[PDB]
Design a binder for this molecule. Structure first.
Ligand SMILES: *[C@@H]1O[C@H](CO)[C@@H](O[C@@H]2O[C@H](CO)[C@@H](O)[C@H](O)[C@H]2NC(C)=O)[C@H](O)[C@H]1NC(C)=O
Ligand SMILES: *[C@@H]1O[C@H](CO)[C@@H](O[C@@H]2O[C@H](CO)[C@@H](O)[C@H](O)[C@H]2NC(C)=O)[C@H](O)[C@H]1NC(C)=O
Ligand SMILES: *[C@@H]1O[C@H](CO)[C@@H](O)[C@H](O)[C@H]1NC(C)=O
Ligand SMILES: *[C@@H]1O[C@H](CO)[C@@H](O)[C@H](O)[C@H]1NC(C)=O
Ligand SMILES: *[C@@H]1O[C@H](CO)[C@@H](O)[C@H](O)[C@H]1NC(C)=O
Ligand SMILES: *[C@@H]1O[C@H](CO)[C@@H](O)[C@H](O)[C@H]1NC(C)=O
Ligand SMILES: *[C@@H]1O[C@H](CO)[C@@H](O)[C@H](O)[C@H]1NC(C)=O
Ligand SMILES: *[C@@H]1O[C@H](CO)[C@@H](O)[C@H](O)[C@H]1NC(C)=O
Ligand SMILES: *[C@@H]1O[C@H](CO)[C@@H](O)[C@H](O)[C@H]1NC(C)=O
Lengths: 120, 99, 361, 254, 50, 49
């Protein structure tokens, strides 16, 4: 909050603008990275209510209805195992929507094969 | 140590932020690291010099932080491009690429 | 946004344009509770004073010296300060204070100053030219004068050489004005050095007794401990104020804290060595220092070809500290929140997106 | 008044291990559940500390160099150790610091004292013997405070002379060990900072005689020297230092 | 005088470390490509053209 | 080996620790690169005589 410091800092020009723009580019790059990785389908697929897959069990990777976060047991374990002018911007996609995207991808690859990745 | 790759990224980001905060406690050759102490203890002809030393030290620290963040951003972007490639080729189809 | 982007046409999107600063409102200057005052009662209000020759010197250390109590008194005729001004005495701090006390005549008060001359300066009490301190004198005809004559007060009238600054001569050796030895007898040319002031109430104002206290302030390389009282501005909580607690200054919101400090600890630091907890010196309570809600100011707009309506996002700022909607990203003003879900047009964050249809979020 | 003590028994001084003692709080700052690395005058871990005895006939009151700081450990019962002697030349030429704890209070004085060659206090079996000085000419600082105080009590003290400030850190510990220093961790709280502004290069312990010649009560004390080094201090949730790491002791702690 | 030498040498060392980090990123990309070629060309037959 | 230089250098903070950490990361990254490229088998196969 020192006004004399800011007056002296104005002598150095647009260094602060360059630093802010670089950090803004990194911040939008993270959201672009998440968008490229997880948002590869525009249809939200769901598994059928009856889990008859010829003996194949996907309970450890499908979302758990009992959990409020709608995560898989494996995803829940993964989330449990990870533990002055500064601001932290929130990610554009929340963890629930990333889990929903993974659920849609799992439902597509279980019920439809590789057909959903190439068309209907 | 199964999830060490994500933990390394989290630890590096937190440690870089902590180092950027701890660089504020360094005077960088000035009489004090606090701007208020310099502004209250000295007249503006010498307080200008001391504040200038603090400004150049903190600016060098911030440029170093932004540069290493850009390098880590490039690394994370490469990893994310690889992850998107694995999402397209291993999940959305069957890949003939070995390993 | 046009100013930031250096263009008169703004493409549809969100643009970080400024920063929202909460401005500090008050200044809170809390230092310790005012205890241990300096013994000015035993100097000024003393029942008996010393003579000018055997002048009393009292060393004042390790207390709080309130000089405005002395300065605002109407009982003093002379309060002439040399080398420092009375207004800033109450702020500065000194290593030691020398209080020299004596009784002189009314016409002899002028000689207690740097660079002066006279019997008192040459032979009784000499002040240096480079003197920092104050000379305080007041009339004491009521106490130090009796109708028969008070001969308890004495002065040196003769010495071979002038006194050095802050020197005391209490010798009662017979003054030799001639070549002949005195031999202890007050005969021809040999006088007794110390003479008495016969203080009587009916004397003139230039001959009435005046009690003089000279305060000598020096700063030495030792830690300065005679400091002036520091006031305590009434503590204000839950507002972004500039706090000064025992010399630790900053800007923040001071709220109640659940952290139980140990009795010797005063300030609190996090991992990054920033002060986030503090102890109030007046009342032993713990206060959390939350940084003021600085945030980014982003402008969400469609194309200027389409419309001129905008929305403002204050990042990481609660809506009570600034069509107002609270998001996890921050407070969004100017966008109507709807319960329907559409595709993301302008990204806001935390799953929130904005679009134009008015601007909806 | 001074009295020469001529019934001592000649014995070389002892030495023992410091273990993990001598740690104090470097500042007045609360820290919660965090590890802080600090560079200050600290006592080295597992170091060689000098051991002095008071037993009957042992009466150990020598003058030792102060160096950069003094760690004083006391395995004390019945309050024999009462104070310390601080100075450079210990005479009226220079200015010396006196720390005394008599039967009522603790007195800290910085004056020009004429120290005796053998200074002590005395308890008659009632405290009625004070022979530690003969004169007091020019005083700069006086401070009267609240009293600080099988071997039952363990008293740790740290004395530092930094920028004219005299820091006294202290800790009282209830122990039940008979002879040597117990092994454990106890961080010393800061007790009092003194604005003395004087040079100190030598010190001397002050003991108390028992009269019924004289008899020395059972006491034992230890002198350690402070060196500039780095410690890694652990702060718990309640904000007390529970463990420390000496960065220059062994490669593991490094 | 040491302040001038320290700031000059520190700027030189920071420049060197930044260049080394950029070159290390380039070499890491090349090594990832080499590992991909080792997996797909040596340990199997690749249908990828060129 | 100048102790006055190091005392003045400590006023600038943890720049040296940052540079050492970056160089250590590069140094272990080179070994990781060699490990990733060449150590793709855990069995040492041998040709027939
Ligand atoms: C699929 O696998 C899940 C988990 O491995 C099976 O759920 C288990 O069912 C048994 C039988 O009641 C329980 O004792 C276990 O506690 C269940 N595990 C969990 C994690 O809930 C499930 O039965 C399998 N088969 C089908 C058809 O879903
Ligand atoms: C106790 O013993 C000390 C040690 O001899 C005496 O100190 C000496 O005092 C004489 C006084 O004439 C000095 O000339 C010596 O130089 C002193 N020696 C030292 C080493 O200080 C002390 O006086 C004795 N106490 C009494 C009461 O006689
Ligand atoms: C001294 O006496 C005066 C006269 O009553 C009184 O007002 C004053 O408070 C006393 N003390 C001091 C320190 O001046
Ligand atoms: C400070 O003084 C006030 C009265 O002005 C009193 O209420 C409070 O208890 C005191 N605090 C301490 C720590 O002495
Ligand atoms: C302590 O010092 C004495 C002599 O000063 C020596 O004999 C002894 O071995 C030392 N002990 C240790 C553990 O270094
Ligand atoms: C302890 O010393 C102080 C200061 O000299 C004195 O006021 C007090 O009476 C003494 N007490 C005893 C028991 O000697
Ligand atoms: C110190 O004491 C001696 C005699 O006790 C005296 O002559 C001298 O003036 C004193 N010095 C100071 C600075 O008080
Ligand atoms: C302190 O005392 C020692 C020993 O008498 C002497 O060598 C040193 O120069 C003194 N320091 C100061 C600042 O007087
Ligand atoms: C802090 O103290 C409380 C009781 O005072 C105790 O229950 C708690 O376990 C302590 N915490 C630690 C980390 O020792």
């Amino acid at each position: 909050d020192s006004t004399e410091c800011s007056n002296l800092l104005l002598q150095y020009g647009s260094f602060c603008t360059q630093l802010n723009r670089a950090l803004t580019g990194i911040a939008v790059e993270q959201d672009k990275n998440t968008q490229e990785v997880f948002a590869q389908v525009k249809q939200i697929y769901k598994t059928p209510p009856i889990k008859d897959f010829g003996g194949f069990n996907f309970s450890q990777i499908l979302p758990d209805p009992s959990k409020p976060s709608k995560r898989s047991p494996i995803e829940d374990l993964l989330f449990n195992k990870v533990t002055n002018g500064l601001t932290v911007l929130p990610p554009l996609l929340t963890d629930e929507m990333i889990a929903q995207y993974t659920s849609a991808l799992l439902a597509g690859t279980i019920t439809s094969g590789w057909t959903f990745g190439a068309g209907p | 140590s199964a999830l060490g790759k994500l933990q390394d990224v989290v630890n590096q980001n937190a440690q870089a932020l902590n180092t950027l905060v701890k660089q504020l406690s360094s005077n960088f050759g000035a009489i004090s690291s606090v701007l208020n102490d310099i502004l209250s203890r000295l007249d503006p002809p010498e307080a200008e010099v001391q504040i200038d030393r603090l400004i150049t030290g903190r600016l060098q620290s911030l440029q170093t932080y932004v540069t290493q963040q850009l390098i880590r951003a490039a690394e994370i972007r490469a990893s994310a491009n690889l992850a998107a490639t694995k999402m397209s080729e291993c999940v959305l189809g069957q890949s003939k690429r070995v390993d | 946004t046009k100013c930031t982007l250096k263009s008169f046409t703004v493409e549809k999107g969100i643009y970080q344009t400024s920063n929202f600063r909460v401005q500090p409102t008050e200044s809170i200057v809390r230092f310790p509770n005012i205890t241990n005052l300096c013994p000015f009662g035993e100097v000024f209000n003393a029942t008996r004073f010393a003579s000018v020759y055997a002048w009393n010197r009292k060393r004042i250390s390790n207390c709080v010296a309130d000089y405005s109590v002395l300065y605002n008194s109407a009982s003093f005729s002379t309060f002439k300060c040399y080398g420092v001004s009375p207004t800033k005495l109450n702020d500065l701090c000194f290593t030691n204070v020398y209080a020299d006390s004596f009784v002189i005549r009314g016409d002899e008060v002028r000689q207690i100053a740097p660079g002066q001359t006279g019997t008192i300066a040459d032979y009784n009490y000499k002040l240096p030219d480079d003197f920092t301190g104050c000379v305080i004198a007041w009339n004491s005809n009521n106490l130090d004068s009796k109708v028969g004559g008070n001969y308890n007060y004495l002065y040196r009238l003769f010495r071979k050489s002038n006194l050095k600054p802050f020197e005391r001569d209490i010798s009662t050796e017979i003054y030799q004005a001639g070549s002949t030895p005195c031999n202890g007898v007050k005969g021809f040319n040999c006088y007794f050095p110390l003479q008495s002031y016969g203080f009587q109430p009916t004397y003139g104002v230039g001959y009435q007794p005046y009690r003089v206290v000279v305060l000598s302030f020096e700063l030495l390389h030792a830690p300065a401990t005679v400091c002036g009282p520091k006031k305590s501005t009434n503590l204000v909580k839950n507002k972004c104020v500039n706090f000064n607690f025992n010399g630790l200054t900053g800007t923040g919101v001071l709220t109640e804290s659940n952290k139980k400090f140990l009795p010797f600890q005063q300030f609190g630091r996090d991992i990054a060595d920033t002060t986030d907890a503090v102890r109030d010196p007046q009342t032993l309570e713990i206060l959390d220092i939350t940084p003021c809600s600085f945030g980014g100011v982003s402008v969400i707009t469609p194309g200027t070809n389409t419309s001129n309506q905008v929305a403002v996002l204050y990042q990481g700022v609660n809506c009570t500290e600034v069509n107002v909607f609270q998001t996890r990203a921050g407070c969004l003003i100017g966008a109507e929140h709807v319960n329907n879900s559409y595709e993301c047009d302008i990204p806001i964050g935390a799953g929130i997106c904005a679009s134009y249809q008015s601007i909806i979020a | 008044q001074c009295v020469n003590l001529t019934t001592r028994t000649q014995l070389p001084p002892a030495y023992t291990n410091s273990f993990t003692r001598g740690v104090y709080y470097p500042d007045k700052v609360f820290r919660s559940s965090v590890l802080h690395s600090t560079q200050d005058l600290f006592l080295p871990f597992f170091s060689n500390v000098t051991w002095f005895h008071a037993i009957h006939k042992r009466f150990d009151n020598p003058v030792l160099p102060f160096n950069d700081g003094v760690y004083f450990a006391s395995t004390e019962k019945s309050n024999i150790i009462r104070g310390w002697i601080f100075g450079t030349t210990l005479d009226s030429k220079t200015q010396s610091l006196l720390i005394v704890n008599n039967a009522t209070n603790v007195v800290i004085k910085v004056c020009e004292f004429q120290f005796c060659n053998d200074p002590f206090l005395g308890v008659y079996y009632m405290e009625s013997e004070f022979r530690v000085y003969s004169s007091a000419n020019n005083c700069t600082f006086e401070y009267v405070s609240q009293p600080f105080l099988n071997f039952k009590n363990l008293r740790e003290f740290v004395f530092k002379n930094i920028d004219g400030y005299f820091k006294i850190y202290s800790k009282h510990t209830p122990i039940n060990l008979v002879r040597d220093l117990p092994q454990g961790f106890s961080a010393l709280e800061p007790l009092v900072d003194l604005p003395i502004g004087i040079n100190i290069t030598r010190f001397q312990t002050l003991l108390a005689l028992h009269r019924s010649g004289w008899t020395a009560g059972a006491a034992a004390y230890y002198v350690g020297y402070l060196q500039p080094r780095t410690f890694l201090l652990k702060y718990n949730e309640n904000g007390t230092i529970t463990d420390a790491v000496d960065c220059a002791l062994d490669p593991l702690s490094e």
